[PDB]
């Protein structure tokens, strides 16, 4: 059985992790463009390379964690090291606006790469714990929703709380508040790591545990080929929408701070959909659930763009569209799990299949970031921090309505089967 203490600890750890990563995954490109003053192509290339490398370097840390064997175990020391190292790197990451000249770029690149590596170090053992720590059979289906609930909650809280803090502490210096926000994030991160370390214990240990094989496996499982292709498009679309929102709601729409309403508050609908999910699944067939998952985001985007003309930016429009998008994201995220086992049923060949999803996710995120960088650089000058020059609104609109094409492609690929 699983106690409540362990579930709470394993939810708090995930809360800390996502609470650390959200700000970097939302406000980084905006920070560089509108605060530091970097170019656009440089940011695009930096993000592309520094995310592809982090996507491809995951397996190595698996070998390192397998090899480590010492007094404290083989996961706790790595988690403890990663927490502090990543916290210090993150604090240093939001102070690039104190330099100037050639060294300014070098510092940016070095700090970003360090952040990626340290986060990977901190993250791998934390998720490697579950199969070993207290899991015999079917006791994981009860533990799994706990960490993901807090993982979803962290992003909403950060999105709803960020801007007011900087605004209160900012004024003529709009990074000095970012540094303090980073301090708060680090405090929460360290507290969560301490709690999980003190309230998680190890049981059910284990011992003793090619590219040609990979390509053979990919070719053999045609269903597996469709699974990864389906996942990639949705990941890219979601990354585009989540990343570019600040630019859209600062330039195209009147910058009256409807971004928190659009994301943070619809987070509540996300949480409700997640918490009531089993009854909804029992009520309805899986195919219709998948169709709704792929449909709702398109409705949100259609409402957004369609009402973007001849309106005063209806509040009901923004919140409703956000609710639709969050419902779709939560439903698709939960539905992803069931398909992998069915696909793979027909080295280990299951541990290998475990990492392919993460590979695809990170690759899609990097590709989306590069795409945004290039397209934004093409049309106009965003770093101006000035009134939106006309004829750039078309560029921003196409940027933010491109995801619907990826949603369409995912729907077609699924409908094929």
């Amino acid at each position: 059985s699983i106690s409540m203490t362990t579930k709470l600890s394993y939810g708090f750890g995930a809360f800390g992790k996502d609470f650390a990563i959200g700000i970097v995954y939302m406000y980084l490109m905006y920070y560089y463009t509108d605060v530091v003053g970097l170019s656009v192509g440089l940011v695009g290339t930096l993000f592309l390379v520094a995310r592809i490398w982090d996507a491809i370097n995951d397996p190595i840390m698996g070998w390192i964690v397998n090899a480590t064997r010492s007094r404290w175990g083989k996961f706790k020391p790595w988690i403890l090291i990663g927490t502090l190292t990543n916290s210090l790197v993150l604090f240093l990451l939001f102070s690039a606006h104190l330099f100037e000249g050639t060294a300014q770029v070098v510092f940016v690149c070095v700090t970003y790469i360090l952040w990626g590596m340290t986060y990977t170090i901190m993250d791998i053992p934390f998720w490697s714990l579950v199969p070993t720590i207290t899991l015999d059979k079917r006791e994981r289906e009860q533990l799994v929703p706990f960490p993901r609930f807090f993982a979803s909650l962290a992003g909403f809280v950060t999105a709803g709380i960020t801007l007011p803090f900087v605004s209160y502490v900012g004024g003529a210096d709009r990074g000095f508040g970012f540094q303090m926000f980073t301090l708060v994030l680090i405090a929460f991160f360290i507290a969560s790591t301490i709690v999980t370390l003190r309230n998680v214990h190890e049981v059910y240990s284990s011992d003793n545990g090619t590219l040609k094989t990979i390509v053979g496996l990919i070719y053999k499982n045609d269903q597996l080929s469709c699974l990864l292709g389906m996942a990639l498009a949705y990941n890219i679309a979601s990354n585009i929408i989540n990343g570019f929102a600040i630019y859209y709601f600062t330039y195209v729409i009147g910058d009256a701070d409807l971004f928190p309403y659009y994301l943070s508050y619809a987070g509540a609908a996300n949480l409700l959909t997640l918490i009531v999910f089993p009854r909804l699944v029992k009520m309805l067939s899986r195919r219709i659930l998948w169709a709704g998952a792929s449909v709702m985001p398109v409705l949100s985007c259609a409402g957004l763009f369609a009402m973007a003309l001849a309106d005063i930016h209806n509040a009901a429009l923004i919140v409703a569209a956000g609710i639709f998008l969050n419902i779709g994201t939560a439903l698709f995220w939960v539905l992803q799990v069931i398909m992998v086992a069915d696909t793979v049923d027909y080295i280990r060949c299951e541990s290998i299949a475990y990492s392919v999803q993460t590979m695809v996710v990170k690759g899609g995120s990097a590709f989306a970031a590069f795409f945004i960088a290039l397209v934004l650089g093409l049309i106009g000058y965003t770093p101006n921090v000035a009134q939106s020059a006309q004829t750039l609104q078309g560029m921003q609109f196409i940027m933010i309505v491109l995801p619907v094409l990826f949603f369409m492609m995912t729907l077609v690929l699924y409908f094929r089967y």
């Epitope: 199969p131 070993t132 899991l135 015999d136 059979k137 079917r138 059910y204 240990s205 284990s206």
Partner: nanobody, 115 residues
Framework: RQLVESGGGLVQPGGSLRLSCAVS????????MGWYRQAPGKEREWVAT???????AYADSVKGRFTISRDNAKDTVYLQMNSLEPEDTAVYYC??????????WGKGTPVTVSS
């Protein structure tokens, strides 16, 4: 379902044995299967357990001597025993933890080691 246990016999001290707990009526990918041993004038005690993933836990007394393995192809669990001692003489049962409605113990097999 039903658990049928085999092996068993007489071995002098320092010998080795293998016990196979054939299972049926439940999809072999299922709750961990464990072993217990009971001796005259004593109660049942736990020996070892192996989960569906393949992670194994052992009792202190048998640590470093007994090993537990899971085989899905044969739908069986194997307990290898080495350096058996007179204190290790007992009847060994094949427990199927999980599914609290039915634990469904096995009859057990008697193994004795004497001079």
């Amino acid at each position: 379902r039903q658990l049928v246990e085999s092996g068993g016999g007489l071995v002098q001290p320092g010998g080795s044995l293998r016990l196979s707990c054939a299972v049926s009526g439940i999809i072999f990918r299922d709750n961990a299967m464990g072993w217990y041993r009971q001796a005259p004038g004593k109660e049942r005690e736990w020996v070892a357990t192996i989960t569906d993933l393949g992670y194994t836990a052992y009792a202190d007394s048998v640590k470093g001597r007994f090993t537990i393995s899971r085989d899905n192809a044969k739908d069986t669990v194997y307990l290898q025993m080495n350096s058996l001692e007179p204190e290790d003489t007992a009847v060994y049962y094949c427990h199927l933890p999980g599914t609290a409605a039915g634990d469904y113990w096995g009859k057990g097999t008697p193994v004795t080691v004497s001079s």
